[PDB]
Chain A
Amino acid sequence: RVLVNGTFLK
């Protein structure tokens, strides 16, 4: 499964 919230804004 993928990260729930995804990566943090760059």
Chain B
Amino acid sequence: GSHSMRYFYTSVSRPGRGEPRFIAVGYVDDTQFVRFDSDAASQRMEPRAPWIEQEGPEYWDQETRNVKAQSQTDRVDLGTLRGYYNQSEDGSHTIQIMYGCDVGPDGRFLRGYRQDAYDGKDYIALNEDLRSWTAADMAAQITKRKWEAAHAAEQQRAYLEGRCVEWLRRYLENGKETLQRTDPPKTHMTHHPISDHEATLRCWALGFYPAEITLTWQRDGEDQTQDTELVETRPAGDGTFQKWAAVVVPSGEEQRYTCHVQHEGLPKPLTLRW
């Protein structure tokens, strides 16, 4: 279905000596494909997926120079925001920036996004119209007026509707064998006695891609949320995801309980019973 390209930037000030720690990561849907880490020896944007490795030397040289320019902007902005909020030189502060585009299954632009945080709270965001900004406080209000004067929204909108979608389309083609492939969950159920009268039923989903999934329990064909535990979806580390849903039941009654699995990779929802 729909696809996304997102970039995440984190800049952390280092009050004792030196530039801030800067980390940039690029994702296509749930797959990381590039990274820049200021603490790494290379000082280059690096490939994190095999399908991006085929990009030429000038792609890497430009990506390296462009992401380094963002780290310098972040360095200057950490100093600027410290002034806006009247903070001391002794503290560590954080700026986070996220932006990206969504394309339809065919390849055309759906939506764009851009938002910035300071010290883990909203600072400034580009609105849904991609033409105006939302400033969370008076410090972000100063930035908004600088950006309105400088036509910052217009440059972000142009990237999001232009280069962003053009490059996401190229990436989707280059990595089609893996990016356009859905891996359905591999499911199983386990049983864990708590006492001689109660037991936990655990329903597992392993090796799925994309990360989006729904695990739900039913007792005699009705939705059960009481005595349930669902862990957050977690990376397997190989590109796939995992999740489990558990329910505490009276021993002898486990046949009343059914686990329901919904995932893009399943042509029809799946049911598991003990």
Residues in A lying within 8 Å of B, measured CB to CB = 1-10
Beyond A1-B164, A9-B146, 12 additional contacts (C-beta under 8 Å) are A1-B59, A2-B7, A2-B26, A2-B70, A3-B99, A4-B62, A8-B146, A8-B152, A9-B73, A9-B76, A10-B80, A10-B146
Complex: how many Å from CA A7 to CA B66?
10
A5 adjacent to B66 (CB under 8 Å):
yes
**B60-89 CB contact bits vs A (8 Å, 1 = yes)?**
001100110110010011001100000000
Q: Does B116 contact A (CB under 8 A)?
A: yes
B residues neighboring A (CB under 8 Å)? 7, 24, 26, 45, 59, 62-63, 66-67, 69-70, 73, 76-77, 80-81, 97, 99, 116, 123-124, 143, 146-147, 150, 152, 155-156, 159, 163-164, 167
Q: Is the CB of A7 within 8 A of B167?
A: no
- B80 pairs with A1, CB closer than 8 A: no
* Smallest CB gap from B166: residue in A: A1
CB-CB under 8 A from B70, the residues of chain A are 2-3, 6-7
Majority-rule SS of A interface residues: loop
List 20 interface pairs A-B (beta carbons < 8 Å), by A numbering.
A1-B59, A1-B163, A1-B164, A2-B7, A2-B45, A2-B63, A2-B66, A3-B66, A3-B70, A3-B155, A3-B156, A6-B66, A7-B70, A7-B73, A7-B116, A8-B146, A9-B77, A10-B77, A10-B116, A10-B143
* Nearest CB on A from B154, distance (A): 11
List the count of A-B residue pairs having beta carbons below 8 Å apart: 55
Query: In the assembly, what is the distance between CA of A9 and CA of B97, in Å?
Result: 13
Closest B residue by C-beta to A3: B159
User: What chain B residues lie within 8 Å of A6 (beta carbons)?
Assistant: 66-67, 69-70, 73
CB distance from A6 to the nearest CB of B (A): 4
CB distance from B102 to the nearest CB of A (A): 16
Closest residue of chain A to B167, judged by CB? A1
Complex Cα gap A7–B124 (Å): 12
Interfacial chain A residues near B76, Cβ < 8 Å: 9-10
- Chain B residues near A8 (CB-CB < 8 A): 73, 146-147, 150, 152, 155
Q: Considering the chains assembled together, what is the distance between the CA atoms of A10 and B116 in angstroms?
A: 10
Q: Which 10 A-B pairs have the closest CB atoms?
A: A6-B70, A10-B77, A8-B152, A10-B143, A1-B167, A6-B69, A6-B73, A2-B66, A10-B80, A4-B66
A6–B99 Cα gap in the complex (Å)? Answer: 11
